[PDB]
């Protein structure tokens, strides 16, 4: 979508031109490489919509 931001306690994705945070998920984010390569990377969960539903 846009940009990662934090309010100091939680991380969100938001669109670049109007602050509107959403939870970070497999659907608004995509993978490349691994955690060693990127400069200034940080740690958080990324939520999966699928597994908690397909468990039941």
């Amino acid at each position: 979508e846009g940009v990662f931001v934090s309010n100091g306690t939680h991380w969100f994705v938001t669109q670049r031109n109007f602050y509107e945070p959403q939870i970070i998920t497999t659907d608004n984010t995509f993978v490349s490489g691994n955690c060693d390569v990127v400069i200034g990377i940080v740690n958080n969960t990324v939520y999966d919509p699928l597994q908690p539903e397909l468990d039941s």
């Binding site: 490489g33 390569v37 990127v38 400069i39 200034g40």
Partner: protein, 49 residues
Amino acid sequence: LQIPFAMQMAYRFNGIGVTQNVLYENQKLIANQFNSAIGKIQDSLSSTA
């Protein structure tokens, strides 16, 4: 609006249709190409009026 410069270039890469991870996986190399090309301009301008 303040923004970190390695984020500004990732959006400018995205604007030319190149996926932004192509910057982060190569950031130091990209910066060395930029710094070298800046260097060549001093030489170029110093060579002839």
